[PDB]
Design a binder for this molecule. Structure first.
Ligand SMILES: [Cl-]
Ligand SMILES: [Cl-]
Ligand SMILES: [Cl-]
Ligand SMILES: [Cl-]
Lengths: 258, 258, 258, 257
């Protein structure tokens, strides 16, 4: 009977996790800024796995009223919340010298303030109902090791780790655990694929040589795929990981061991 | 059809893990300094899971001849080796001023040299058969933070981490992943129970208040259970954690979040 | 002939670092929200060290126009900049379920965006003039370990570590190094001294029990003092620490060793 | 103030002995090669004069030897203020070919010797009420596991663990303890001799080994003996009294955790 709320649910990784959770037997609130994508995914889940397994919702995670309204809506639809997945954030690269304040502010709003607001709202619902819940943030190796030309992304992602640990400490007395998943490069993803040019120029190499460059830094000699993320998420979300909380869990093929 | 070799399988945590592995489907090589405890545990698994599921072996993991003979005995018994679990080590508490060399040396032998020997012999078997195998070390929060009056235990357990990371780097090309599990206090274990009077003094409090003193340091407000151990182990040993290697996985109720 | 700019130089710790830097032989730009505080401390410094040693400047580090003007003002005044010290931001406590967005937001502006603006604008000066400069941020043990009831503060202080590492990588090619200093508790701060009541309440004990309570957490059995900060600051700002960059330097009396 | 340097009779260790004396320390220069320790202390004695440095023999892996060094320094100098532990050399092999004797040796030299020398010299500090300093020379391989160097990594990570436990045990006596996590000392004789192996370890020509490692480092150079000496002096000083139990990176930004 568990309910999963996925912020950033309407596309790519977030959308897969939504389908993955549904396949695992959760009911899913697909929540996105693009309501049309949210509802289109919810219908696809329902076509694939049965009636009423998902519902689509609009939220701007950066806005307090919007977050409050989503939580009200989710409660009205499903009556409980068990698992919050927060998926958001896109790195915009520039040397510190030329990094815009608007971009830095955006990174902070989308990766930190939205994470805060969604966590605060859904933990309240978990507490109300005596639910030993789970909060899982999608994060990055960039939240473990500073990324050259990506100060806004690293600052925001490091910050995510700090928030995950404060939330874990605040929420432990209610049986809610909180983690951040520190993902390696989703090399075949549409986002990674579209930046192969930009990487080529930062690294001084050809677009076609970028994926081998990054593969070669991974001990297991391959990039991360969405199923790697889902599988880790599933375990940490489950009752079997009840004694783990506040962690930065690496999913990096061994590239990060700290 | 996988085989798990559990070094330290004859008693307490290690026995619990052998049984749990068998519950999960594994054939189990119960390996132990006490061959009699090992053979008896194997008998118990066989009556519960069917003939030939488990066999007992003698090993002294500090002795190279003994470990090489264990790996040959496992190979002759089962087709193969898929998971190595290394479970050994008990802390001895003394201020550095009084710490004996013999005990420091023994902490290294048992916690580190044995881990190295077992990893070495069993990895050659995995490599021989092209098995995408698993090596899992039982370690401690004292391998994440040095522990007062436990210099020997901390040196050895931090050591185990370094070994894990090196082994992960050496074997990744063969699809073998390597992890350390950084356990909290196993408050219910017979060892922990026996030491209540010694910790009572060392702290400056009664025996009865020890468990609550250590429980209070934990955000989740309980001790580590054998089941928590087995849960985490089974995940990292599974094909669902194929993109994780070289890690220090905390199982601490949020006491350790770095 | 080096010039130090200290943001938040007009009182308490910032004021102590300004004096300490003048003593070490620096020209000091005292930058603060309170311009009269900035000017008077600079007068004190010139009354001891000679006219034109120190100048006071107004800055709102959270405002881009105010930071960009500060940089123009310092350049007009001293003609160069060698060391940026960013010393800003305070702790506001409340469990996540009552923690306000305004405060979370303010924490990010003061602790993080100010640090990004100041680093941006003074790095450009350092680059222009070919200076192998230093950027040092005042951070907290709360940027190493998440703080119960202090989500806004931990998020922002961890985010500072991330910004420090990305800065370091962006600026390495120019011989500029960047560090974050992870301070323990400044128990004899006015700040800390005035908050004894709240910690008393939060923890459940008389205000007279509060300093003892935090002391006993430190292995060195001492609170952090301003001179420890200065000491470490001076070393990492020196040409002796040229091969160190991107570091989170603990100044914690052994409370934090990771 | 007296400094004891283990492994002081050669290379980085020698460098450190010359630097501490220049910085104003009385040096007890201690090595397995007693001939080296004796003449480095006279190399030192022909610059800073006489009675400065003294050469002692020690097999840091041997309890008797280490305890005899501790009684001898107390006779020679009357006190101990700083212990520098400088030993250990990496032997490379894939785990599958790694010899036990080599693993055992790495632990004895890198970890057991550090334990023994910290134990003995810390007693001498406690006796004379000294708020002293124990500093270990370690490596980035004590921060991140090194491929084909299981022995060296296990040992060097071990040393961090020991550093932290020591710090916690010795804090009530005002003694601080740290490990220095060094980058590659590219010009050292050791590094220079092993370029062919590193070259065949990585599938490069020898001459292209150093630039392959320099390119890894955000500051774009190797670690220098002087970077080591600079950090040691700071953490060895009373200015660093509030720092203990740390792993201090000296890696040009290659390691930031
Ligand atoms: Cl945990
Ligand atoms: Cl990983
Ligand atoms: Cl560094
Ligand atoms: Cl510290």
């Amino acid at each position: 009977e568990q309910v999963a709320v996925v912020i950033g649910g309407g596309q790519t990784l977030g959308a897969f996790l939504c389908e993955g959770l549904a396949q695992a037997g959760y009911h899913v609130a697909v929540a996105d800024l693009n309501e049309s994508n949210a509802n289109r995914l919810a219908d696809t889940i329902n076509s694939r796995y049965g009636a009423g397994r998902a519902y689509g919702f609009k939220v701007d995670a950066t806005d307090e009223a919007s977050v409050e309204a989503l939580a009200r809506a989710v409660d009205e639809t499903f009556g409980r919340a068990d698992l919050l997945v927060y998926s958001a954030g896109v790195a915009k690269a520039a040397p510190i010298t030329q990094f815009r304040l608007t971009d830095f502010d955006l990174s902070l709003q989308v990766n930190l303030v939205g994470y805060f607001l969604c966590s605060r709202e859904f933990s309240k619902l978990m507490i109300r109902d005596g639910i030993k819940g789970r909060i899982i943030q999608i994060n990055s190796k960039s939240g473990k090791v500073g990324s050259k030309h990506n100060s806004g992304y690293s600052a925001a992602k490091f910050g995510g780790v700090g928030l995950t640990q404060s939330l874990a400490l605040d929420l432990a007395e209610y049986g809610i655990t909180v983690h951040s998943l520190m993902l390696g490069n989703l090399l075949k993803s549409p986002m990674f694929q579209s930046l192969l040019p930009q990487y080529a120029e930062k690294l001084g190499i050809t677009p076609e040589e970028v994926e081998p460059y990054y593969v070669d830094k991974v001990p297991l000699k391959r990039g991360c795929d969405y199923q790697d993320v889902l599988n880790v998420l599933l375990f940490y979300a489950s009752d079997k990981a009840a004694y783990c909380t506040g962690q930065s869990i690496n999913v990096t093929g061994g590239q990060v061991m700290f």
